[PDB]
Amino acid sequence: AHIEKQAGELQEKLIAVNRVSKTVKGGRIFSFTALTVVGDGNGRVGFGYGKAREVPAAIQKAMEKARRNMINVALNNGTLQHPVKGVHTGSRVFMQPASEGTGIIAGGAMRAVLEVAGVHNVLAKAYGSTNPINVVRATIDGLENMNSPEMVAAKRGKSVEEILGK
Amino acid sequence: GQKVHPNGIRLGIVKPWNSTWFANTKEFADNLDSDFKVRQYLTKELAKASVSRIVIER
Amino acid sequence: PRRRVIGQRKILPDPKFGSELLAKFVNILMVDGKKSTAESIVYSALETLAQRSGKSELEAFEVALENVRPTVEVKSRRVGGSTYQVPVEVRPVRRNALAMRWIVEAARKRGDKSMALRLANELSDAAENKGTAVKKREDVHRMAEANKAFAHYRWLSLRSFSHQAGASSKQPALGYLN
Amino acid sequence: AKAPIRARKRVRKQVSDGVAHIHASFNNTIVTITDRQGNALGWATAGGSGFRGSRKSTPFAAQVAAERCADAVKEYGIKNLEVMVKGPGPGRESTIRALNAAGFRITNITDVTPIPHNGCRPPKKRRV
Amino acid sequence: PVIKVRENEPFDVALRRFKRSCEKAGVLAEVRRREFYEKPTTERKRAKASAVKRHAKKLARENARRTRLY
Amino acid sequence: HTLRADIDYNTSEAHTTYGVIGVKVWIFKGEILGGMAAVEQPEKPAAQPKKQQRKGRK
RNA sequence: UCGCCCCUGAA
RNA sequence: GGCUGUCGUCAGCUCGUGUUGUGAAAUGUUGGGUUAAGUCCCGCAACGAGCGCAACCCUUAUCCUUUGUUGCCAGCGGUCCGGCCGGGAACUCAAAGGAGACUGCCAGUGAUAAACUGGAGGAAGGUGGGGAUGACGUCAAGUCAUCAUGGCCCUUACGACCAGGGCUACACACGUGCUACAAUGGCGCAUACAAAGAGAAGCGACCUCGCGAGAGCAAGCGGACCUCAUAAAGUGCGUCGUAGUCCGGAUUGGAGUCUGCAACUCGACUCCAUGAAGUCGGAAUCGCUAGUAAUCGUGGAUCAGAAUGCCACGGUGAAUACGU
RNA sequence: CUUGAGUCUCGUAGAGGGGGGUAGAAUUCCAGGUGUAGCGGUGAAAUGCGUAGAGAUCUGGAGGAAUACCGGUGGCGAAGGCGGCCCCCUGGACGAAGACUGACGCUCAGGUGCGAAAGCGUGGGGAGCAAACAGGAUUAGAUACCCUGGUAGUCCACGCCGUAAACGAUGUCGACUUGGAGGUUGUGCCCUUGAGGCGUGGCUUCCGGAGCUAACGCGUUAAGUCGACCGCCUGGGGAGUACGGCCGCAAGGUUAAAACUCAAAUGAAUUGACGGGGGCCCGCACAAGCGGUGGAGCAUGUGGUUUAAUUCGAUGCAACGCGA
User: Fold this and answer.
1) Hey, is D9 helix, strand or coil?
2) Would you say A36 and A61 are in contact if contact means Cβ atoms under 8 Å apart?
3) Residues of C (135-174) whose Cβ lies below 8 Å from E
4) DSSP H helices in A78-148
5) Helix %, strand %, coil % of chain F (to 5)
6) Residue A136 and residue A112 in contact, taking contact as beta carbons nearer than 8 Å
7) Distance separating alpha carbons of residues D20 and D98, to the nearest angstrom
């Protein structure tokens, strides 16, 4: 994709951070992996999974890859414009728009991912097994998938032209 | 053990010796001991400069 | 597991036969890696043979040994399809080795003074098959010709036979013997 | 090999022809030459040759038995075979070939072999 | 392992190992073992699995055939 | 294992209250140039067909 | 084809 | 901590970047050929790169170059006939430096690729042979006793020093070696050739004495000088005759030696006597594919003074390998 | 009203169901003949069977059970399930023109019927195989797998029980949504001038797109996208057990808990590891050879034991002539 870490407006942030393992021929190795997001407070948000032998380069590489998995989002107000109740992976995702005068209200991944993405008055919820790692798939289920007033308005405008043409 | 440290001829005719001297028949022992002793006190009393390595030529 | 050809030994001609075959008969009669002490007995026993028998210098060994060597040696390997150990028809080179070895073995079953006199008299009785070193032959060759199930490993081999054209009886094995 | 010799007391049952029965069993090999009047002349088997184990069904074991049998029919004067190969084990051309190479020739290849239509139920046999 | 059809010509070794293929196919080897209806029928469906896959293999093979690596 | 390169190697050790921490620093300064496999003078082949001898006869 | 079991724990 | 063993001299082990997967991860590194080799070639979402293999380093198999003394001796002389002296540097030798081997070349085979099989030239062909080379790691493997060090403990002591004793007890068991059980040998005679190291707390020629070990006398030597050093198996002869012996050598006693301040438990060597078990070893189990095995000596370190050990050096010198 | 459903007509194919006849092969028994010292089994064996004549082989007769090939993801049925051949009675499916009925439909707790195999009752039948059982074998033991026999049973008739990993682990019905290849069965068309060329329906495999899924995969015959109705689940162990009811002749089946106890149980997939899993490739790993050790003595270490001390550490290989 394209950069989401941009001078004078960058909004670096992290999500997960942990270690994972592979069982090698000898002993067992540890790969320092982590999820990140850089925002701008205006959308443009992504995610990356680094692999490293150290925690700093785990976040380095994950923010490289964050820019390579940027998704665009555009909105008005401090809240998302459309509810998306879609589910990606086995973590169940829900997402309402909500009037200003309320917080993010979420302790999971979607506390921080729903901050960087220019939203902070959104109300969201999740069901199913607790697992922050795929709460992050609310990139798919709300930011990537959306509707906007001028999208729906051009449905109503497309139809009129066809009747005239015949 | 895990690393056996191969350096025993990397500092041979591949890179210079770090204490080049000669000794005769009954001098072998003496020259050995005397050199090493000096270096202990030397390296300790100097720490205001960044030691690349002491060497001696006898 | 074995890569490339085996070694070959180039050895000297004898100073009384010119042979490398009967140089290999000094080699068998070496002990403690001494060819010196070996060569003694060899010639000492050559003479013993010449007196006690007719023959020739290349018949005192040769002919006598061609009555000690079997043409089949039975080796070992657990597989056989009956837990059998298979006959192996030996190459003419390995024929030599067997008989040569056995004649020296036979002189350690004797105590008839020296070592020359031992193997000499033995070789004199070994050309008419009335020795005791020719009776070693009569167990290797007796076995082999009275019992066979060949070099096939019967269960493994049979599957291979069936696939190729349909058989259960002996043929080349197309499939694995693994 | 090690197979016994055989002989018979009659030389009056010949017709110059006889069925070569072969039962190439997975655990044995029987070779029996019956006359073409359907009355025995000779018989022989691998176990009587002296073989034991599963080396009673082997090619070698089948040959020896075919030749033991040959000694038991020679005195009548027989020189034609009506080969009846049967059973699943080896020895199924071992016997044939041996006979040919023993002053007989083949004349007929016939099939008399049990083929069930499942009027009896098989055993389980081996399972180790 | 043979059929009733005869060979009347001189032989020491004759063709009778494709009279094996006109009789035996394991039909004298099923007399010492019991099976369920399930067992042999599933095996038949591995010889028609062979035949459908035969077509599929040819597409894969064609790419390899282009280049020389043998 | 390069025999045509200047393989450096020295050690240090700390002696902290956390235990002892060994240090090993291996710098591969050369890569195709020695320091005693290069820059040296051998001697002989002097290329003279006569090997001098004492003369006179007695 | 030659049966053949049994094995306290955190690096 | 440092050091080391270990699988393993294993051909493996990773990583960056991209792509694939929600992820763990994967790809690469897999496949088709091939090599000792993640070796090389081709292909394939892989493209590159690092470590290990290999690589470059030593040494040896040849031939050349220097230098010729304490080493060599042909052509040249002495002779004392001995490289002992002059002469000659040719030769061997030493040991510094080069020449060389790379599937380089020839043919076939192999995708026309790598490679494989024969061939040639050569001292040597196909990782030439042997060293160094022993990865990243795993085993909380060992080692606080080589040394280093966090904590802990001892403080007219657990510290320190000395004389005596114990480490070499002992009724046994196990591991690793060595020596025999013999004529291919033993013993007696005579006789053949070594290499590589060692050395003024040393080795010690010579000559004298001692059965000997060794002692006295003393030259030489820090040295291709001199000495240890007489190599030993081997070899030509004398014998003995298959016996527990002319095999074998344990045990003990007495008599001596040496090195030491002093050799009693607890030094080694020698002399004479005594003369062992063993007549060639079950179940089982281990090493080894060539200058190796086998066997025979020699030297070295440690060492005032103790090698069947370790470490190293040469002599003689195989059997067998169808085949996995 | 006809698009849903149903009927009529005409054909089509099939192991659909039930009943009754009929053929041969094979095993077995019995009888006769021939021939003689073995047979049979196994990795080896043994029990068992044979001179009172077996095994094999041939001829005659009899009986029971099952129908080689056929034969295939081939076919049919609601499912369970259903195979030689023929007749009789009888069910379902599908297609083709039309013709007719006119939502008459869909599903379903209860209820009712159908139920592989074993089992049970009653009566027939009994060859082979085989629980049980008895010898033998393997094993330390082997009440087993293995071998030799062998009873109930399997088989037939009737009734009963109603279970099964009763499976596509996938409720049934209706509706939709890319396709490709094969199989099978109707029917229309095309010089049918080609066993076929082009369609269009029914059924059936394999592949796979989108989509779905946590993934494996499913994938127009869905686990896709919808609706209708019913059934079930709501942590695991406790337990498909107890208790009561119900059903059964019984065996049991059916309905179906709780106390108590635990922080997991579990599914799919990833990498390595292991496999008496497979394939591939090497090494004195084996085969083939050569030489040892364990026997004996001595040398050396260790354990055990003893001692005032036998200073300490190492522990298959990788400790135990090791540190020393």
Assistant:
1) coil
2) no
3) 165-169
4) 113-116
5) 0, 15, 85
6) no
7) 12
Q: Give residue D89's identity as a one-letter amino acid code.
A: G
Chain F interface, mutation test: which of B15, B20, B43, B55, most F Cβ atoms within 10 Å? B15
DSSP state letter for F29? -
Q: How many CB atoms lie within 10 A of CB E19?
A: 20
User: Are C165 and E17 within 8 A, CB to CB?
Assistant: yes
Contact: C167, E20; criterion CB under 8 Å: yes
Nucleotide nearest to E48 (CA to C1'): I73
Which CATH number does the domain housing residue C64 bear? 1.10.455.10
In angstroms, how far is I227 C1' from C66 CA? 99
Residue D66 CB contacts under 8 Å (≥ 6 apart), including other chains: D22, D31, D44, D94, D95, D98, D99, D102
The domain of C49 spans 20-143
Separation in Å, CA C140 to CA A104, C73, C78, C146 = 94, 6, 18, 10
Question: What does the block give as tokens for C145?
Answer: 């010709």
Q: Contact B35/B56 with Cβ under 8 angstroms?
A: yes
Amino acid at D125: K
- The structure tokens 């390296």 sit at B43
Give the closest residue to C36 by CA, choosing from C15, C55, C52, C19.
C15
Contact D101 E29 (CB under 8 A): no
Contact A32, A53 (CB under 8 A): yes
Of E6, E11, E27, the CB nearest to D115: E27
Cβ neighbours of D55 in C, within 8 Å: 82, 84, 147, 149
Give the C-alpha separation, A7 to F48, whole Å: 77
Q: Which amino acid type is present at position C114?
A: S
DSSP labels, C104-137? HHTTSS--SSSSHHHHHHHHHSTTTT-SSSSTTH
CB distance E1–C165 less than 8 Å? no
Please give the interface size between D and E, counted as residue pairs whose CB atoms are below 8 Å apart: 70
Q: What's the gap between Cα D90 and its chain centre?
A: 12
Distance to chain D for C170, nearest Cα, Å: 7
Q: What is the token pair recorded at C140?
A: 């290797």
Cα–Cα distance, C22 to C43 (Å, whole number): 11
Of chain D, the end-to-end C-alpha distance in Å amounts to 34
